[PDB]
Amino acid sequence: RARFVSKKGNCNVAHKNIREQGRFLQDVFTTLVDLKWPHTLLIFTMSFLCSWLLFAMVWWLIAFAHGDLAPGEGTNVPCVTSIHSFSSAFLFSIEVQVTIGFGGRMVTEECPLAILILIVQNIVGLMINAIMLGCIFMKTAQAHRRAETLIFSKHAVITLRHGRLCFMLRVGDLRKSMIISATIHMQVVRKTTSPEGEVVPLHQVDIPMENGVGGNGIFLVAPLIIYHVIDSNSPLYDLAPSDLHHHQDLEIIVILEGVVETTGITTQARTSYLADEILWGQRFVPIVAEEDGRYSVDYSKFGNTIKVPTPLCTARQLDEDRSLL
Template identity: 50%
Template sequence: MALEDSTFSSRPESLSLPVPEKGEEPVQEAKEDAPPTGVFNVSEELGHVVTTETSTPPQPSTNNNMSFQDKMAAREAQANQHRKKLQGVGQERGKFGWARSKRKRQRYVEKNGRCNVQHGNMRETYRYLTDIFTTLVDLNWRCSLFVFVMAYAVTWLFFGAIWYLIAYCRGDLDHLEDETWTPCVNNVNGFISAFLFSIETETTIGYGHRVITDQCPVGTMLLLLQAILGSMVNAFMVGCMFVKISQPNKRAETLVFSRNAVISLRDDKLCLMFRVGDLRSSHIVGANMRAKLIKSKQTQEGEFIPLDQTDISVGFETGDDRLFLVSPLVISHEIDSRSPFWDMSQTQLEKEDFEIVVILEGMVEATGMTCQARSSYLAEEVLWGHRFSPMMSLAEGFFDVDYGAFHHTFEVDTPSCSARELALAAARREAHLYWSISSRLDEEKWEGPNLTEQSRKPTDSESVSEKKEGDGPTFIVGGVTDTQDQSVVGEQNGSITTDQSESEA
């Protein structure tokens, strides 16, 4: 009974509660055995005992007949019910009472690199027409194919209609059976034949059935005009399609980033790290890595800056941002005094709301065009105290890279404090070590057998006798003179100075 009524201040993590036998009803017994105040709720998730204050009425003393195992099982069931209630308090409820998950932070850049920004209320749309080539290249494939087909079809129809109009105005359609009549274009007897002649002229096919004659100067001018405009349309549209097909955006699909970023120690310094790799055998020439911190802030003047961009150094000063991306690399950002994560600890990281955008730029070796791959990491995607698993092994004659472990991480011992606190602790240790070593050296220096005998200061009688016996100056070990010049000489000679004032006396 004394064991049952005792208070348990803590519970070890390895404590396992016995399961009640069949036929028993621990939940009903818990209702009967509810203590008045200070109920101990044992939580499996927290690993310790949580005390809650309740206002249940006192129960009769017959509950003391329950065994200790039954009481612990009842308290465990009550703790589970209390935990479920706490989980449901902070969640929103839907239409039918289902709990809604917490809304995730809106990404500025998606994981696939697409920027989640849409431009609206733009009144200067004419600027798109001034750069029509880039506008056509930026269109999606459906619109690009539509523009490509319509560009040729409209020009063919336009010049076909003009050829038909010329034949109609000259009367060529009225003299189709007259062999003595010389038409502008042979074998043009309607709009369809004029349209086919327009196609042959613009595409330079030249079947030879429909031919322009020398009796139509207007047709000759129109033929030159259509040939020139047709070449321009052909060059423009084929160029747009070629650039769109060979865009380096598709090359960025084979540049992959790790699913999570990690924070752990490297050379006794906290570092933010993520992994990047290239799936193709053709390399990215001149690969360069950049990183940005996207976070809203408020200035000292009260100005609110949404989605403020702060640069995160990944080795710009040392040249580590220039990559030789042959195998997957781990990009590291050292959290120092210039880093935006200088004051961020593990607990603060769980409360922060930010986004890290990483950008990899380089030149495609096959085409010579510059490509850019992007990704981002939210605050909940940054794992504190983790490290990336190794994925490279030495095979027979080559290095084998296992991309199955590209996103794998494992936990390592990492302090949960911020980089500032870690640096201060290291500085204190170094200062304590420095002063302890210097103090020991001073003790050994001044407590030596020879120096202790010499450092004994003579009495007044001894100094007077020495003055009488010797004519030279008196040497005093460790003495301090009054003038500044004598103190400097004493420091240079190992704190052994000459008392000139007594010698002159």
Template identity: 50%
Template sequence: MALENSIFPSRPDSLSLPVEEKVESEEVEVATEVTASTGVFNVSEELGHVVTTETTSSLPNSAPVKRSFQSKLAEREANANQHRKKTQGTEKERGRFGWARTRRKRQRYVEKNGRCNVQHGNMRETYRYLTDIFTTLVDLNWRCSLFVFVMAYAVTWLFFGAIWYLIAYCRGDLDHLEDETWTPCVNNVNGFISAFLFSIETETTIGYGHRVITDQCPVGTMLLLLQAILGSMVNAFMVGCMFVKISQPNKRAETLVFSKHAVISPRDDKLCLMFRVGDLRSSHIVGANIRAKLIKSKQTQEGEFIPLDQTDISVGFETGDDRLFLVSPLVISHEIDAHSPFWDMSQAQLEKEDFEIVVILEGMVEATGMTCQARSSYLAEELLWGHRFSPMMSLAEGFFDIDYGAFHHTFEVDTPSCSARELSLAAARLDAHLYWSISSRLDEEPTLANQAAKQPDSGSANSKGGEPTFIVGEMTDIQEQSGLGELNGSVATDQSESEA
């Protein structure tokens, strides 16, 4: 520990072992004498901060403390942990000169519920919203949509009601209300309220029969046709907007769930990044497709800074594994290979990184045929190294039972803390070691055969009439000269075969 190294630079080995009570008291006295003169400070690398405690300059000798050095050190670390819990409101990290500073929490690019945390400002070409008024009305929130829906009908009714009142006023129908010989433009219109009611009856085609237009008013006839046409257009437009807004697949995405955490663990001897996705409804998503993006700022070799740079994370596009049959929850896996942005990232480096992984699930809603998109994201601190998702499927009587209570559960597995690159290099070294060890053994066999072939008088004693003799398991000089010997060097023939 740091305290032991600072107080006892040359302490004996007996301090780390249990000793007698007398020795313990002597050690405590020595420690208190040193701390009385220099002050006690405990630097814990695990805690990440310095805890300073001042002590009195003298310790009464009448009450000796009978505690070991390790117990006292453990007590100080416990006090430091309590102090850490009190000041754990903000995460601390070391600055350039060792000063503690507050670590800024990363702002999400995409929220966990799929909402993109982006606001557009200083837009000068706002007229473009009016060119696509239908989409603009559909994109409005429900409060604004209902307000526009009510005002669209109210304004048209008031507008045409005012025109009907103006026609009656200009023709003098209001001055001949009691004259039975006078033929008005619209019967029983005696004020603005009655004209407004007639406008509502005309546009909604209610037709109560009390207020009707007469054939003595050609201007009224033209206005009636115009209001009927415009009223039909308003009905179609507003009803269409409300229908599209109600049937939007955004609410369907609420039943598509993603796991709270992503995990990194081995799968088939390869380090993989995995997360889980599921569908809570019985109606399926047709043609479901999954993709992932890495959101991280970077600086190019030319010095250009790119904020929130997007990099594709392969989740099976080359093999077709990104096309899902989402009947039961699935674990989506990204193999960390040489093309992965996590190729050089280890567990220690992961804790220091600042990035965000955005996952997007797209598909067609089976009930409505509309395209649905569900989104979620994972920050660097939401990646669990050395974890795996718990199983949640069991076989019941005639069907498969899915326990969504274990959807977000994970458990720890044995996972190396090094990066995928280091794992690949270690595996390559192991394969190379096995290869060279086998080949070296094969090379030893021809050397043994050559030594046996060079033994003196091995071939002359057995030769008859100058004929070459082949010995089992050995090589002759004739074979060495002709170059017919193999690398393993063993020739097994018969006398009859050599003569033949």
């Protein structure tokens, strides 16, 4: 069946019938700073070559028009000394534009028109250099790759903790670098029909993450199983343990947000768990172990799971049995 957002974190829902009013290009550089590296490098070299060829053509033409292009000895001084053909003119254009300044061909004080073309060439060169540096730097603050290094366990299990049904999922870090003030927004989606006859195709509802006195966020050093307790007030509380594996369509997504240390940008990661991915009545294997003088974490058992003799029943019926026991 159709998934809401894919495991890799990319969004699945394909958009249709967007009334484009042009804002897609109106974000001129915040559009292309999104692109890949080959496309952005291609369009940067094309910017540079476009400008260089434009001014090389205009210079070729101005040297042709002054008549300094006509090879002649005396009665003149070329506006640009030692210019012969188009090739040397393009060499002059790249010599003055990108500010190497070879000086074999000298622009002279006889023609003020060449002064004007230089005084606009250089400023446009400097402006396009300034933007083509700022945008590549604004790019190198792409830290979604740091959204790649995070990992979640492939499937999530539920258990019985403290006499109440609980669901456990793992997270973890993959580098030395921490993520500042990460917060968890844990959401459930379902095609819902209201008592008013209103049917929604998809209905996001927050399920709380259960920490100390409150709080939406967590602290990530070692793999920490996130711990929620479904109660009669919770939206997930009504389902049955035998109807989840095959038929029902329930996506439980988690969105972890946080700002990486060194860049300072705020990244996040998104993952979905389907009704066929989740399973019932198990327990993860303890990862952390007291090694020689530290805590060793073994990621081989990250996705490992052991059987646990826990009663199998619906959370509504389990709450009724708790009322009975």
